[PDB]
Amino acid sequence: HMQLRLYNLRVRGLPSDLMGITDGYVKVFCGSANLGETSVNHNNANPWWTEEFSHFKAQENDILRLEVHDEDTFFDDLLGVCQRQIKVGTHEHDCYLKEGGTLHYMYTLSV
């Protein structure tokens, strides 16, 4: 087992919602294990989140998948997906979201 820690999620420049400012949250997977989701950062085009995510059964080269969604009343909209293979150490990354904006994040993979 290796330990993965995913943290410092933030987005710059989310697009408009159908009505007003987007209500973003991030869902986190590692090797298709569901690691959970952040709270919704309501009415914020440039959110950052305090939440962090750990996975104590990771392996090097597992695929980290980050999904940025907009919360809505009837159907949430998936704005973008960032995927990469995890490497030992601490790494900072950014990702351009299909529907607009850029996601920045860090992770640490250990032991």
- Write out the residues near Ca ion by the rule CB under 5 A: 17, 20-21, 23, 43, 70, 72, 77
User: Distances from the Cα of 102 to the Cαs of 6, 12, 54, 56, 106, in angstroms?
Assistant: 17, 5, 23, 28, 14
Nearest residue (CB) to Ca ion, 17 versus 37: 17
Least Å from the CB of residue 1 to Ca ion: 37
Q: Considering beta carbons, is residue 6 or 103 the nearer one to Ca ion?
A: 103
Distances (CA, A) of 87 to 11, 32, 34, 39, 42: 23, 16, 19, 27, 32
Identity of residue 94: D
For residue 25, the SS3 value is strand
Looking at the Cβ atoms of 60 and 72, the one nearer to Ca ion is 72
Binding site annotation covers 17?
A: yes
77 labelled binding-site residue? yes
Residue 70 in marked binding region = yes
Q: Was 23 annotated as part of a binding site?
A: yes
Tokens found for residue 104 = 């920045």
Residue ranges at the known binding site for Ca(2+): 17, 21, 23, 43, 70-72, 77
